Amino acid sequence: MQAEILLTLKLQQKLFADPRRISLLKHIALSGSISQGAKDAGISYKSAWDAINEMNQLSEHILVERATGAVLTRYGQRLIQLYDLLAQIQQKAFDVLSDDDALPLNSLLAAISRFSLQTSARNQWFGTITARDHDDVQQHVDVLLADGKTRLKVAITAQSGARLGLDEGKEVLILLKAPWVGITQDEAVAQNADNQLPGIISHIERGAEQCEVLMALPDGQTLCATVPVNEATSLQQGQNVTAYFNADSVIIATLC
Amino acid sequence: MQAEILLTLKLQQKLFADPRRISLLKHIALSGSISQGAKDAGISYKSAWDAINEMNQLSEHILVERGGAVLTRYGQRLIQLYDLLAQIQQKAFDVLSDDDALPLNSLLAAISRFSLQTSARNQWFGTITARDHDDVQQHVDVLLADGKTRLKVAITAQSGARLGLDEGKEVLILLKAPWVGITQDEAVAQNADNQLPGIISHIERGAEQCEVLMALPDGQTLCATVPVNEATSLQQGQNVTAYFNADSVIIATLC
């Protein structure tokens, strides 16, 4: 149903971790024998003793000493935890980024966001940092959406701006939680916010305390916003509205 | 240390992709022919071929075609997916390549470290303990990785289902600084869906904004961006209560 990937780990032009090799380090921890491990995994205490004296060496920490004066070392234990994990990634990055005509939309950042974690934000957009100040506490950056026609002002702490490398040209991902988006026909109300997105209500579902207003954007895309009732009562479908939100109500996401 | 990660990819229990088959396909794209495309990589012009149609054998497609040989849409893709995965795994290694800095052996905690990075100054790992069925906006309750403090979050119904946010599900809590206030009027604190008592450890004053750092009983640090407007009585080493609402937090889960 799938395919199997094998993680080979080379350390300074040579070999360090082979699937069969990690199998040895694990079988030597469950057997506790210099050989029984080499045995419990298709090796002959040779490709095993040779792949170890050369594995302890290449490694910055002995992975298996003797017994008391075949036993491992904490670092040998972390190597197993590390590899196995590095093995899990593969499968998922592979399971995701899976294939074909069905899913695909952009590259690197756009593709990593596909297997990486996912957020509850109903509005996620890709853009590019076109500017940024240098306020000692809170800074503001300008983002030009992948549509090259939409501008947005976002605010983040300086420590954050510095670590994500939000410099000019940086490709980002705008995470806007539906509740941070307002809908209005009152161009005045929309114009008081830092961000405005014109559009028409393509759908409106009214709950008991909240309402999910879906807005069709000139893009074709849909902006989602959760508006209370005492604010989303006059709103109707097919109406020309304007989504608005302030710069401090947005999260940024970069690979850095 | 100073390590490279060569990636061996196999399907149907057979060598499908290999760094060499890739350099084979990449040079076929550079030279345009299998002929040169072979030497410019690693001999056997007279082998590469059964190796290219063996992959055309393993995928049912025809990775590479044929004056000379031109890659396919599936050939360049498979080339981009390998190289892509080649980076991902390289990073994953390097970011994680530590001596004692574990992501709680959680794919989540681990993935979060090398994959997309967010600007939220407050990110805590937790586990969903509950969730309602309200049609429009639901509410999930979280129990952080300290098994004590419970948070309450609000998400759209589609987000609740699309992520599988049910009991036991592991999540990462994203809380941007500006959505967190810090008071002492228990009336303000108790009024917010969320409240976390602490003690101010530092206060960065600015022309209009302040950056208050409160140390959580955890021993960590919560960060809030407070308008000097709402930071007139805030001082250092003071027992305060940080507060935020349920609809001001984003959840990040796996798949």
Ligand code: MOO
């Ligand atoms: O599901 Mo959200 O986090 O309200 O956009």
Ligand code: MOO
């Ligand atoms: O630095 Mo922020 O204000 O948590 O995105």
Ligand SMILES: [Cl-]
């Ligand atoms: Cl509701």
